[PDB]
Structure 1
Amino acid sequence: PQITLWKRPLVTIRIGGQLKEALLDTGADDTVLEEMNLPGKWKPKMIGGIGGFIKVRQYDQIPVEICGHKAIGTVLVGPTPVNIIGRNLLTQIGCTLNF
């Protein structure tokens, strides 16, 4: 797809058995999902941006489908206000910024 930026670039993703809406975010190094009771082993992490840092749970080798395109990698879970797909998974689906 080609996605314009008039509005927030929200797409459907599949992760952990759930369909969700998530933000395609070239500013994010990694992927962070709204709080959910995902199974598996995890390790604690802090991530930071506008407003400071939040504590999240880091899960590894998690399958994610983004708009029909498959990926697998690290997913963070915690008190983000929006589900965010970052560069770690955007590169796996071939996404580029074009102008």
Structure 2
Amino acid sequence: PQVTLWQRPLVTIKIGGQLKEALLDTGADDTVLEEMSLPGRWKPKMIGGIGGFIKVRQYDQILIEICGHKAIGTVLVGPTPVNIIGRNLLTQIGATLNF
């Protein structure tokens, strides 16, 4: 799907048996999800934001289905106001920016 940017690019994702809506964010290095329940297995970390620093938990090897595609990797889970799919997963989904 070619996604024009007049509207926020939102996609449906499935994680840990749950359905969410997430943002395709080319500016994000990692993926960060709003507080959710996960089986695991997790490490802490604080990240960079605008503005401020947020402590997040690091879950690696998480299966994510994004718009239909299966992808595995590390997702941070923190106090985000929105679900963000950063480059770590975008690359697996074979996503691209065109202009």
TM range (shorter): over 0.9
Q: Deviations over 1:30-78 (max 9, x none)?
A: 0000011211010001111211110000001000011011100001101
Distance 1:58 1:41 in 2: 8
1:71-94 CA distances to partner (integer Å, 9 max, x unpaired)? 000011010000100000000010
- Cα distance per residue 1:1-56 (max 9 Å; x no partner): 10011011011001111010000000000000001121101000111121111000
Q: Indicate the SS of the match to 1:93.
A: coil
Determine what percentage of the aligned residue pairs are the same residue. 92
TM-score w.r.t. the length of structure 1 is 0.97
Q: Which runs of 5+ in 2 are unaligned?
A: none
Q: TM-score when scaled to structure 2? A: 0.97
Q: Cα RMSD between the aligned structures?
A: 0.6
Gaps of 5+ in 1: none
Aligned residues: 99
